[PDB]
Amino acid sequence: SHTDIKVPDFSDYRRPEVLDSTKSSKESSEARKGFSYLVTATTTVGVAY
Amino acid sequence: RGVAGALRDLKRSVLCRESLRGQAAGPLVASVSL
Amino acid sequence: VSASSRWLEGIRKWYYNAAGFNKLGLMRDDTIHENDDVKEAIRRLPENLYNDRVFRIKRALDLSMRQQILPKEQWTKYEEDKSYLEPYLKEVIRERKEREEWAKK
Amino acid sequence: AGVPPHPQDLEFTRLPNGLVIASLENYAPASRIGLFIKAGSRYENSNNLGTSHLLRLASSLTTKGASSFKITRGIEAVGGKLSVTSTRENMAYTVECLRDDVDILMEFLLNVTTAPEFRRWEVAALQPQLRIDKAVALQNPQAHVIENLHAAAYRNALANSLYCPDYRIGKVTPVELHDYVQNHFTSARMALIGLGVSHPVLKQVAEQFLNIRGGLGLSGAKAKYHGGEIREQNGDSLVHAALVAESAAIGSAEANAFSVLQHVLGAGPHVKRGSNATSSLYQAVAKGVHQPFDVSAFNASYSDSGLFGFYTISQAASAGDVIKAAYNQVKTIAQGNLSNPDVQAAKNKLKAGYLMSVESSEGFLDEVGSQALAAGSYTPPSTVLQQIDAVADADVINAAKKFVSGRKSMAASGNLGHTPFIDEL
Amino acid sequence: TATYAQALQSVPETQVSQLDNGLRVASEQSSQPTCTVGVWIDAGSRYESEKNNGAGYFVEHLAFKGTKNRPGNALEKEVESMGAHLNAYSTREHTAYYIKALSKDLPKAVELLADIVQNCSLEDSQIEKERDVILQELQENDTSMRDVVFNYLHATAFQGTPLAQSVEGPSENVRKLSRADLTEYLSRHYKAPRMVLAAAGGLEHRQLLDLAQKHFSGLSGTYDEDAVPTLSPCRFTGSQICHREDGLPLAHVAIAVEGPGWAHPDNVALQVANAIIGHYDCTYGGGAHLSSPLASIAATNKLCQSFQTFNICYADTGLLGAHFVCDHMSIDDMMFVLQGQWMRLCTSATESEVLRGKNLLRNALVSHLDGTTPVCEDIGRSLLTYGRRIPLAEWESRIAEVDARVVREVCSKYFYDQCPAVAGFGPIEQLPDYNRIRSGMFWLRF
Amino acid sequence: VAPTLTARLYSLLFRRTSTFALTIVVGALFFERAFDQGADAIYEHINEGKLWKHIKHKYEN
Amino acid sequence: LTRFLGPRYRQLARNWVPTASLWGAVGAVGLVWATDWRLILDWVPYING
Ligand SMILES: CCCCCCCCCCCCCC(=O)OC[C@H](COP(=O)(O)OCC[N+](C)(C)C)OC(=O)CCCCCCCCCCCCC
Ligand SMILES: CCCCCC(=O)OC[C@H](COP(=O)([O-])OCCN)OC(=O)CCCCC
Ligand SMILES: CCCCCC(=O)OC[C@H](COP(=O)([O-])OCCN)OC(=O)CCCCC
């Protein structure tokens, strides 16, 4: 009965790269982290200045 | 890992007749290790 | 081997009385500083030696509170001082050095 | 052609001090060595009960040649294993490793078994492990029943439990461990078995380090079969029950007849989720019991005694029906209702089962070590199948007769409101 | 004398042959009276759609219930009568049916396997009786927190893909799976080039090939025009699923990052790193002196009842991580120590501990292929995943290549600054927040 | 430039925290020079006549 | 405190020398940047203003 549990669909939340079930997340693993960590680094630069 | 063999945390439940076969004992042994 | 040995032991007995922990009924091993090696050795002591260690220290702290010493009859004689803790402590140290030697390879 | 080489046959030696060495060079990448000792829980008495359990848990404590830290790290460094397996009759100290590290683990094995120190503080810190180890084992209901079944069956020795009685947890002393090793871990009580080891090496080790004298004689006091019943009301979902009689000592011809009777009645399943068509106990109970259940023949053979019978699992209200149906099925066999195709199939199950039990190095080593202490020899498989073939149908019927007429021992746990006593069978 | 390396050369070569229909026949001959023989099929729940997700497991319940030639328990009586043992299992990628029997009974054992995989009579009366059996098994599996939390890990890690599905399927599927769904599953997946007749024990490879052409030539090796199933890659998703249930006495937690798959050479180095972290049980004897920092810390501080590391492989993907069981006030410390060891191995793996992991894996590999049945499984499964049998001498070569640098590079590739999949079940109030878990996957000091 | 730009920035500079910090301190250095340069050029363009440095040429001495 | 002299400890130091070298560049550049150290900044190309 715990096998009746399925994770709901996040398609209206996911980023564009990771919406394809038949495509690896490793492909966009590199870009997605850089986009978010770029925002952090810029913030520190502004605080630094 | 500690063993108890005799066949010749909530563990789990046995309900049907298919999942009971093999459970009846058939001379106990106790084993410990690292 | 009496000539040179007894002079060294004579200076050690001089220092022992000068240290003065015997004047409170204490033994040498009662005065050692408790580091992790010493807490384990004390933990390993048998019941009687542990209980004796507790009461001697308790009796000495009581004296130290009162700024007193025991009568001279009850002082710990240098020849009767038992190093009851040393053999346990030596093993505890030997075990720690083994761990450290394994941590190097 | 990937044909393998010619397999080397085992070598065997009895030293004059009673020790037994048995080696087999299979040229396997791994080596296995085991010291089998007549030191099981039967050799405890009412004053030191549980001493062999704590001993079973103390293989990594400090020895004269290896600290506790070194035993754990040295074996793990070479990816080896150290285990202690214990029955009511034997303790088996076994060590596994690759070929090139046998010297390392042999030295650890000898220190654990011939020079333990049983340091007072190390022993004290281990006492709570008895409670953990016992609790883990006793969450199988089968462990309760079989332990109670032996306590009810025997007056001494085999009545003793593999697990420490609760009142003794914390009370087992280093002296008792020292005394237990000194008078049970002796040359006349030991067998050194090695797979992937040369015979000269084991013989060298045995003569150099396992020449231990003193202690006690072999087998201690004889096990006196009594009969009786122990009942554990605990309201489990299902009732577990075992009903047995005294059967036969291992190594006797009568014991093979009981082994063949076990596979006639039904020992265990052969097909996943199968109906057990050729299981005479399961079909007997299945006739007038439609709820879930299990039933199995029980066979336990020892040096000086044995227990044969059956083990039932059923709903609490159907417990009596399942037990009486199982007991009557054995009665019909005692009454001579046994065909020759039935006994021939049982011999096939038994003969096939034995060979399958020795295809692994672990299962092979335990068999050779067990034979060395029980029989003082090694009996190859072909001779074992010969002894199985020699079982006549009349021998099987007579074993069933012995069970039906013999004084019974019983153990049961669960909601026992419909589980009969012995005198109600 | 003989060395470890010389012993690896003495292992017999695994002979391999292929029939005209495409059935692959593999065997490792030994000097044994017994043997294990079986058919390994490249079928599992990853090939099943949402409609028929429970069919293969349903077929497992019907494989041994009767055939066209041996109806009812006739098969069951033949196996039991000759003392043989018949068994089977299904995973997300592989299905297997195998028999343990005397070597002399190999001709009959092969005949029965062919009869099962081809002429299974899925009688309607039997299908309905196995319906209630499976449903009862689902109730039983709910009580195993270990089986539950690992199905949860798959459900969230591979969400939206076939690998998210369980092997047994949902409750609803078992009550509407028809005979046509099962026969369509069988006739679509049980093709000869996806099956492997593996054997191990005392037997000549010649006779296994003869029995194969004898009892398996009658098998369809001609696929449909364009109905050849192809496995689509399964998207891994950094995510978390938390089934809070405080009525249970211990928490189960499974955490993992995405692995590469079966045929990736990096699995050897990953398995070495998992061996350094190892496993623990409260019944172990080592305790405080265990080599693994996670294990010794857990034993001394009573942080858990057990943990295990794992590297679960699939086609071009996998689950690399660990699972543990602990008191509700210890989940945070176990997560902390667990992640600290992952980061430590990514950045600061030493040489001596790596030799430890290599040695543990050598012993684990040799000790596992000890008996006719584990060797027969390694034959059948390896021919599906690797397309060949990888000799032990080759595994030793890959393990020996591993040094501390390889572990630091391989672990950083899969662990460091990667999004994990988390699965929690039980009293998990102290289970750290996903952001905090995610932050545990890197070190500000590095 | 077949690999993504943000993807190559991550592998080279952001994966390690050490190089993630070095890119920030080096970024604040070059950001400070360009930001003050552009900010002052905007404040001066709005006020082209008004400032003193726009009138310092009259008062040569 | 001789226990930290061994093969493992010198493998551990070798793993962390690239990281500590880089944290020295962070602090050095951070000190030069925060103090407007003219002795070093006169040599940087674009900063010269
Ligand atoms: C002699 C002078 C020496 C000074 C030289 C200049 C040093 C510049 C700082 C360099 C250190 C940067 C390290 C760092 O960013 O880590 C701390 C967190 C975590 O960043 P995060 O992107 O979340 O994860 C890092 C993962 N990684 C490294 C693999 C990409 O990142 C942050 O959270 C930092 C950005 C947050 C800014 C807000 C906190 C400042 C206080 C609030 C002030 C504004 C409100 C009043
Ligand atoms: C001179 C700076 C010293 C470092 C302080 C710092 O960055 O705090 C750590 C966290 C980010 O690390 P984490 O929470 O991902 O944990 C990572 C552990 N692996 O940053 C925060 O968001 C906390 C806010 C601090 C602002 C004062
Ligand atoms: C520890 C507090 C240091 C503060 C000293 C200080 O006032 O810094 C001024 C100088 C200015 O750079 P300079 O090229 O004019 O050089 C002028 C020389 N007087 O910048 C430096 O030299 C910074 C040196 C930092 C060393 C720790």
Short mmCIF file of N, CA and C in Angstrom, two decimals, chain B:
data_model
loop_
_atom_site.label_atom_id
_atom_site.label_comp_id
_atom_site.label_asym_id
_atom_site.label_seq_id
_atom_site.Cartn_x
_atom_site.Cartn_y
_atom_site.Cartn_z
N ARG B 1 27.93 -9.82 11.38
CA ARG B 1 26.64 -9.48 11.98
C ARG B 1 26.04 -10.68 12.72
N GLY B 2 25.38 -10.42 13.85
CA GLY B 2 24.85 -11.48 14.70
C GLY B 2 23.80 -12.34 14.03
N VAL B 3 23.93 -13.67 14.16
CA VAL B 3 23.09 -14.63 13.46
C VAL B 3 22.42 -15.56 14.48
N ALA B 4 21.20 -15.99 14.13
CA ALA B 4 20.47 -17.05 14.81
C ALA B 4 19.85 -17.88 13.70
N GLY B 5 20.33 -19.12 13.54
CA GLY B 5 19.84 -20.05 12.53
C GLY B 5 19.33 -21.31 13.18
N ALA B 6 18.13 -21.75 12.79
CA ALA B 6 17.49 -22.89 13.43
C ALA B 6 16.73 -23.80 12.46
N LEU B 7 16.83 -23.56 11.15
CA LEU B 7 15.88 -24.12 10.19
C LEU B 7 16.23 -25.54 9.74
N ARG B 8 17.31 -26.13 10.24
CA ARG B 8 17.73 -27.48 9.85
C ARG B 8 18.38 -28.24 11.01
N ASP B 9 13.41 -2.24 16.66
CA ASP B 9 12.90 -2.09 15.30
C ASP B 9 11.88 -3.19 14.99
N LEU B 10 10.68 -2.79 14.56
CA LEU B 10 9.69 -3.77 14.13
C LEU B 10 10.23 -4.55 12.94
N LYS B 11 10.41 -5.86 13.14
CA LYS B 11 11.08 -6.69 12.14
C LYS B 11 10.30 -6.70 10.83
N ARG B 12 9.15 -7.37 10.83
CA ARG B 12 8.18 -7.36 9.73
C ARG B 12 7.04 -8.28 10.16
N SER B 13 5.98 -8.29 9.35
CA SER B 13 4.80 -9.10 9.60
C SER B 13 4.69 -10.21 8.56
N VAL B 14 4.21 -11.37 8.99
CA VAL B 14 3.89 -12.48 8.11
C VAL B 14 2.39 -12.72 8.22
N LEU B 15 1.69 -12.57 7.10
CA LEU B 15 0.23 -12.67 7.04
C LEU B 15 -0.26 -13.86 6.24
N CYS B 16 0.17 -13.99 4.99
CA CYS B 16 -0.35 -15.04 4.12
C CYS B 16 0.34 -16.38 4.40
N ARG B 17 -0.22 -17.43 3.80
CA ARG B 17 0.31 -18.79 3.95
C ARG B 17 1.58 -19.00 3.13
N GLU B 18 1.74 -18.25 2.04
CA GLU B 18 2.94 -18.38 1.21
C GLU B 18 4.17 -17.86 1.93
N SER B 19 4.03 -16.78 2.70
CA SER B 19 5.14 -16.16 3.41
C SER B 19 5.47 -16.82 4.74
N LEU B 20 4.69 -17.82 5.16
CA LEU B 20 5.00 -18.58 6.37
C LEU B 20 5.88 -19.79 6.09
N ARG B 21 5.84 -20.34 4.88
CA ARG B 21 6.63 -21.53 4.58
C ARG B 21 8.12 -21.20 4.64
N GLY B 22 8.88 -22.09 5.29
CA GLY B 22 10.27 -21.86 5.59
C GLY B 22 10.54 -21.34 6.99
N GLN B 23 9.50 -20.87 7.70
CA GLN B 23 9.68 -20.28 9.02
C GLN B 23 9.73 -21.33 10.13
N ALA B 24 9.02 -22.44 9.96
CA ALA B 24 9.03 -23.48 10.98
C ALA B 24 10.44 -24.04 11.14
N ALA B 25 10.90 -24.13 12.39
CA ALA B 25 12.25 -24.59 12.68
C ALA B 25 12.40 -26.07 12.39
N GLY B 26 13.61 -26.47 12.03
CA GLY B 26 13.86 -27.82 11.56
C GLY B 26 15.16 -28.45 12.03
N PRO B 27 17.66 -27.14 15.58
CA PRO B 27 18.88 -27.15 16.39
C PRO B 27 19.52 -25.80 16.28
N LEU B 28 19.39 -24.98 17.31
CA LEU B 28 19.76 -23.58 17.19
C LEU B 28 21.28 -23.42 17.10
N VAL B 29 21.69 -22.37 16.40
CA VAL B 29 23.09 -21.98 16.28
C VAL B 29 23.17 -20.48 16.52
N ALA B 30 24.23 -20.05 17.18
CA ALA B 30 24.46 -18.64 17.48
C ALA B 30 25.86 -18.26 17.00
N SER B 31 25.95 -17.18 16.22
CA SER B 31 27.20 -16.73 15.62
C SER B 31 27.38 -15.23 15.80
N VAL B 32 28.61 -14.83 16.15
CA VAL B 32 29.00 -13.44 16.36
C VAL B 32 30.29 -13.19 15.59
N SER B 33 30.55 -11.93 15.27
CA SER B 33 31.68 -11.58 14.41
C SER B 33 32.12 -10.16 14.73
N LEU B 34 32.92 -9.58 13.82
CA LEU B 34 33.28 -8.15 13.81
C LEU B 34 32.62 -7.38 12.63
#
